[PDB]
Amino acid sequence: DTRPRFLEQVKHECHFFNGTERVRFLDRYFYHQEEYVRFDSDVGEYRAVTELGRPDAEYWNSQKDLLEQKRAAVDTYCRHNYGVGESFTVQRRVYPEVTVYPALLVCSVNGFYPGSIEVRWFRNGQEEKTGVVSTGLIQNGDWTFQTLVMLETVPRSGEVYTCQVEHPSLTSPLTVEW
Template structure:
């Protein structure tokens, strides 16, 4: 183990590759030899149970390893027995590897966990796209951004039916801040009366997000009808308000068969 502190995110990989001495110009190597060591931190339920491993590999075969659950180096092959005996005979080497559970794994878990384990809810937006100079929409794009972890499912629905054949998706892309984004496009030519839904399912959500889109003409027509209806209803209430105001102001109203004036006896119209 080196004396420097190594930052890990659940698992740390340190590879040291030895390819032999530098070759003289014009010569070809007869063989390549590779040695590597990997350092790993395994977490179960956060830091409830932590296991620290160091694996020594020669030519892709692990020959000796340290396991914090055992507390010693263990030989995996005959080649690893001398190394295991050597490491286990050095108290300072054993002490450093045993302390790595706390000093290396748990320490870095507190640093990295808020960035890697905290979930982020996706944001969803739909845009209509046109090909070239064509005025009509021929694609609908569902932009899903800002989510973590990267596993996500995005579906398109047209008039309540899921679309699968005309759907094209990009790969999930990193944003550089531990969040991700994806673009899912539906190839379609919207018509009057059509309705579209982009549905997003993610582990950060208690229920899927459903973003609805309708052709602009339908939306404008609906808003126009709502506006006209509101205007007419307002006129009705205004007329009723003026009538009752004048009635109470003059003290003259009509009822069933009688006219009543302020300060005068009622005069029956039925006589």
């Protein structure tokens, strides 16, 4: 296809801090990956972010009941949808699965959710910060995550190495030893 493509995008975003105690609502309209008009609950009205959206910002802000409706969106939309899915979104907990191999020894924790994780090493009684390389957090796209911590620190005479993983779904640290 020689044909040129034209893309419209709109995103209604709900930002939550300390649960539903502090909510911010954003109504965002995009054209060719370039926002042009936006409503912000902190601002309280539609505003053009580019000149391309100024006819919308003035037209929409003048509509009967528009402002009232958008000012109420933090309660009727964001807080509403937050509580509808709270059981399996904010409260989802899947514990990790750890395995340690060498290739340099690697500890890999998979199938965990949410994303916040802390994994540490111990060579052996004390954690050794040197020689650690972290893969970063990997999003599996199926509501699980991955991570490998590759460790360049050759163990020697019966050295017991333990990858310690700390996830919000468990009450005490998860420890496995090599």
